[PDB]
């Protein structure tokens, strides 16, 4: 049975606890693992019967701390200096398999409980724009995509365009999707004929106006 | 409370085709205190139909509302161009207030095969660390299709995201983008890096790749 999920932003603290519902587990080595969106079970961390050895996964180590008490009714997972790669759907676990290390999620047995934990970005972040390079040669006939990768910004939205306004068909910008870092990605396409490569100038015009980042970038072969 | 759940989901229908949508409540909402809702993206939804079959001011004739007690139905009696929107019943007969899960209204048209194109991720974005290979899936219908990476004939989950842009305007066609991240690391330890699409409109599913370089 377990609590002490929920919303944080990210720096903040939550402590995750489990409680025995049966009693004891108290000679069981106990772990903790989450299930991050759209994602698998990751090891988080573990620790042994006695409360000696303490293991953590890397992406947690330093700012989660797993422990237990003597009666075998309470593990917990202190969790520190939040991220929004934290955000996951946690769980504990008894170990009752050894078919490896005490990092193998797999020698773990849970029973279907979790705690959600989401951790909410705060920043004004602008964008970083890299270039999708166009898909084929000034030289080769059909169509040809290129467009302009727009990463990392919080929050929504940013402004594209594409010529300033001079290219309009043939373009799709992708709506923005809040990757696991708690930021904003997307991006803008647009086809071409392959022909017209080398003779015309594509540039996107990026603008994040919660941060005055506006950014154009001229996107070219490779 | 009282659950509401509308069927279908989706509704594919061509322009001036009439649209049947039904709303069902998991108990009896008294005195027909039954609303419909248009929405449309980045707009509040609008009030389209109040107390099951009234309509809201300046709403036009083609929307109409019947039904009682668990099952009611939002008829469009000609899909207008402005029309296709996603369509929300409530119920505001008892505390809370609850919403159905919409009902999305698109533009049929004839299927389309995507057009399929993969980006490596540019020499710039590698230098800080990360890279990110994207797919682009372009000018397709119907909506749905299966994209999966394969890095080393292998393949890949938890670590591809996807975005689907909404129906086009002018040829009714959706488009989607899968963008595969991974660190740089993990990045130059492989060789092939492949995207395969399937989809109606192909007769075989499409594979676009390169190899790292």
């Known amino acids: 049975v377990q609590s002490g999920g929920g919303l944080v932003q990210a720096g903040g603290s939550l402590r995750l606890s489990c409680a025995a519902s049966?009693?004891?587990?108290?000679?069981?080595?106990m772990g903790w693992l989450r299930q991050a969106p759209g994602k698998g079970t990751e090891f988080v961390a573990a620790?042994?019967?006695?409360?000696?050895?303490?293991i953590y996964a890397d992406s947690v180590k330093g700012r989660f701390t797993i422990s237990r008490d003597n009666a075998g009714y309470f593990i917990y997972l202190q969790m520190n200096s939040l991220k929004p790669e934290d955000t996951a759907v946690y769980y504990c676990?008894?170990?009752?398999?050894?078919?490896?290390?005490?990092?193998?999620?797999?020698?773990?047995?849970?029973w279907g409980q979790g705690t959600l934990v989401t951790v909410s970005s705060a920043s004004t972040k602008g964008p970083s724009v890299f270039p999708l390079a166009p898909s084929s040669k000034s030289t080769s006939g059909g169509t040809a995509a290129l467009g302009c990768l727009v990463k990392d910004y919080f929050p929504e939205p940013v402004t594209v365009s594409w010529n300033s306004g001079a290219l309009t068909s043939g373009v799709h910008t992708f709506p923005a999707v809040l990757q696991s870092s708690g930021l904003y990605s997307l991006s803008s396409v647009v086809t071409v004929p392959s022909s017209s490569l080398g003779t015309q100038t594509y540039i996107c015009n990026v603008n994040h106006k919660p941060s005055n980042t506006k950014v154009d970038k001229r996107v070219e072969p490779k | 409370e009282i659950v509401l759940t509308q069927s279908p989901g989706t509704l594919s229908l061509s322009p001036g085709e009439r649209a049947t949508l039904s709303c069902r409540a998991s108990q009896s909402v008294s005195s027909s205190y039954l609303a419909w809702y248009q929405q449309k993206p980045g707009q509040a939804p609008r009030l389209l139909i109040y107390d099951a079959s009234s309509r809201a001011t300046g709403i036009p004739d083609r929307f109409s509302g019947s039904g009682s007690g668990t099952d009611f139905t939002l008829t469009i009696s000609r899909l207008e161009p402005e029309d296709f929107a996603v369509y929300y019943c409530q119920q505001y007969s008892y505390s809370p207030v609850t919403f159905g899960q919409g009902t999305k209204v698109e533009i049929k048209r004839t299927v389309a095969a995507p057009s399929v194109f993969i980006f490596p991720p540019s020499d710039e974005q590698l230098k800080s660390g990360t890279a990110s290979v994207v797919c682009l899936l372009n000018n397709f219908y119907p909506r749905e299709a299966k994209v999966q990476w394969k890095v080393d004939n292998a393949l890949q989950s938890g670590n591809s995201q996807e975005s689907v842009t909404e129906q086009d305007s002018k040829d009714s066609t959706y488009s989607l983008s899968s963008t595969l991240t991974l660190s740089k690391a993990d990045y130059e330890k492989h060789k092939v890096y492949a995207c395969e699409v399937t989809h109606q409109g192909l007769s075989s599913p499409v594979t676009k790749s390169f190899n790292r370089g």
């Open positions: 620790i042994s019967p006695s409360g000696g050895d303490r």
């Open positions: 676990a008894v170990r009752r398999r050894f078919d490896g290390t005490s990092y193998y999620t797999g020698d773990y047995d849970s």
């Open positions: 049966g009693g004891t587990f108290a000679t069981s080595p």
